[PDB]
Structure 1
Amino acid sequence: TDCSIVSFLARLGCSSCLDYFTTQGLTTIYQIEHYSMDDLASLKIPEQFRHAIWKGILDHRQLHE
């Protein structure tokens, strides 16, 4: 199973957001696992995607991997 941000965003239908993570050196779901709505806003993720990405991160926390 792929822990890349690129796979995570693909699954969420948010691949258009990838370059906002890449420019900050963010490549794995474990780097962003503790990100708030505010952290995502600070990446300049378009507002329309923030809730979906945040719920994806929450879903990852909810696995208790």
Structure 2
Amino acid sequence: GSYPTDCSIVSFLARLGCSSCLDYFTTQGLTTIYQIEHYSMDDLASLKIPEQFRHAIWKGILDHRQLHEFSSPSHLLRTPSS
């Protein structure tokens, strides 16, 4: 519902076994996983998601972010700004 989407908090949470947590996401306006693809433990906690769930959920979101940006020691450089 509401425009086409890919990964939803419903399926995203279902895979982790915490679909009930959706109420906390919807209560703030989050229905898609992408909407929180870059969510922090703070934001997740702000929505009212418990620490026992925010961690699991947060973990799932992080794993999704790694797909877009991988990490490796001594491989690629970057141009830092102070």
TM-score by length of 1: 0.88
Distance in 1, Cα, partners of 2:20 & 2:51: 13
Structure 1 unmatched ranges of 5 or more: none
CA RMSD between the two structures: 1.8
Q: CA shift at 1:55, angstroms?
A: 0.7
Distance in 2, Cα, partners of 1:21 & 1:5: 8
Residues 6-64 of structure 1: CA deviation (Å, up to 9, x unaligned): 10000011112010011112111111011111111111102211111111001100111
Q: Give the match's secondary structure for 1:57.
A: helix
- Point out 4+ residue stretches in structure 1 off by more than 3 angstroms: none
2:50 equivalent among 46, 49, 53: 46
How many residues matched? 65
Worse-superposed segment, 18-27 or 1-10: 1-10
2:17 equivalent among 13, 16, 41: 13
Structure with max Cα Rg: 2
TM-score by length of 2: 0.71
Structure 2 unmatched ranges of 5 or more: 70-82
Higher helix share: 1
Q: CA shift at 1:2, angstroms?
A: 4.5
Distance in 2, Cα, partners of 1:11 & 1:28: 14
